[PDB]
Amino acid sequence: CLRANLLVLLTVVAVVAGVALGLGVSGAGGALALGPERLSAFVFPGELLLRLLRMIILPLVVCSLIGGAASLDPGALGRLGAWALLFFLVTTLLASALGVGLALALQPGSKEVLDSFLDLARNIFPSNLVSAAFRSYSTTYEERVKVPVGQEVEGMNILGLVVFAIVFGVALRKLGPEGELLIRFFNSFNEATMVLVSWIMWYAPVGIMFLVAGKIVEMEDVGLLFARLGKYILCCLLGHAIHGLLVLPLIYFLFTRKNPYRFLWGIVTPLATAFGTSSSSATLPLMMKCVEENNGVAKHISRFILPIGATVNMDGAALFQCVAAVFIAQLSQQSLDFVKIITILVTATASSVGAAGIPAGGVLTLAIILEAVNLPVDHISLILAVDWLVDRSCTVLNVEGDALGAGLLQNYVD
Ligand SMILES: NC(=O)CC[C@H](N)C(=O)O
Ligand code: NA
Ligand code: NA
Ligand code: NA
């Protein structure tokens, strides 16, 4: 059909065929018939796609952000970043409010908060760049009265690398003629990483198919999960659909006076990749590639906004956290007042920034949100029963706001 629409069709067909294949395998026995020896082989292609996507996050993010920050005047870059941060904050607040409202209407029913925010601040300013390339600071507790002791756990410190890349790009821009060589070096490295991303996009349909097939094979008795948490799943999915098809497109159309669904058509493939992988960081390379090629977004604007948006802007995470918090409060028959709603919204918005963009990443912040609202923590056990689905529906939105943000900021630049 094309070289950019054929990929979209192949990815959609891959998602549909993965769902069909997973249902067929589950009907034929699923995990019991296959066993771990065959389940590992069955789900391996999706793991391979995830590994390929994760391998290119660090060079792509670092080089793209250094080039983007070094390609703009410090005042212009500061204004663009302030506007992007305001847009991200407003969209996250809207997502949280929508989630709380839908949870209140449809009625579906550890680490300290300060330590979590201190860990976020520590991750913003990493103590080592090489270590931050594969580790993140995390605080555990010891019984010396609990005392917080921090150490580096596995997991790429994307936020610290983003901050360092931005400040290094600003420094390169301030250098002048002396930094032009490094700007060229990082631009060339990012171009090569884009070539690798374009190659990986062709394997992406197979990986997505096997990812969704294995995901719906592993968690068997899906009908029982629906019979248990239908209202909660409906609240989460309806909130994500409203935010990604009604609220964010309305904002895009109001600010740019352009069709937002044509914008979403060009990023359908990274959206399906996000759904398959349930991680914004891994689908970020495909997001940048599709935004730059399929959409008329500027190279520097995309390379600057999309990594920051992937790290920080998470509408789906905030929406899921708010819906889960209200659902757990309803399960405990805990009445929620106006102040309770406000603190729920604020905590969800703050935690969405600190999310690491990895599968099952909202559950970690859910506990801190419930602690802030003094809601019980045991009921999170129910969420993990269906989180594997809900998180996926989050990731789509978590990237969908970023791209629509960039395309919005493009109109601001033009
Ligand atoms: N529930 C969530 O949104 C957690 C983060 C999600 N896995 C992402 O990468 O966007
Ligand atoms: Na947002
Ligand atoms: Na994001
Ligand atoms: Na985040």
Swiss-Prot record:
Chain segments annotated as transmembrane: 5-34, 48-69, 84-106, 152-175, 185-212, 234-255, 301-327, 388-409
Q: Which stretches are intramembrane?
A: 261-291, 341-374
Task: Give the record's GO biological process terms.
Answer: amino acid transport; erythrocyte differentiation; glutamine secretion; glutamine transport; L-aspartate import across plasma membrane; L-glutamine import across plasma membrane; neutral amino acid transport; protein homotrimerization
Chain positions recorded as Na(+) 1 binding sites: G309, N313, N398, D402
Q: Which residues face the membrane's Extracellular side?
A: 35-47, 107-151, 213-233, 328-340, 375-387
Membrane topology of the entry: Multi-pass membrane protein
- The answer, when asked if Glycoprotein is one of the entry's keywords, is yes
Catalytic activities? L-glutamine(out) + L-serine(in) + Na(+)(out) = L-glutamine(in) + L-serine(out) + Na(+)(in); L-glutamine(in) + L-serine(out) + Na(+)(out) = L-glutamine(out) + L-serine(in) + Na(+)(in); L-threonine(in) + L-glutamine(out) + Na(+)(out) = L-threonine(out) + L-glutamine(in) + Na(+)(in); L-threonine(out) + L-glutamine(in) + Na(+)(out) = L-threonine(in) + L-glutamine(out) + Na(+)(in)
**What family is this protein classified in?**
Belongs to the dicarboxylate/amino acid:cation symporter (DAACS) (TC 2.A.23) family. SLC1A5 subfamily.
Q: What does this protein do?
A: Sodium-coupled antiporter of neutral amino acids. In a tri-substrate transport cycle, exchanges neutral amino acids between the extracellular and intracellular compartments, coupled to the inward cotransport of at least one sodium ion. The preferred substrate is the essential amino acid L-glutamine, a precursor for biosynthesis of proteins, nucleotides and amine sugars as well as an alternative fuel for mitochondrial oxidative phosphorylation. Exchanges L-glutamine with other neutral amino acids such as L-serine, L-threonine and L-asparagine in a bidirectional way. (Microbial infection) Acts as a cell surface receptor for Feline endogenous virus RD114.
- What name does the UniProt record give this protein? Neutral amino acid transporter B(0)
Gene source species: Homo sapiens (Human)
Source gene? SLC1A5
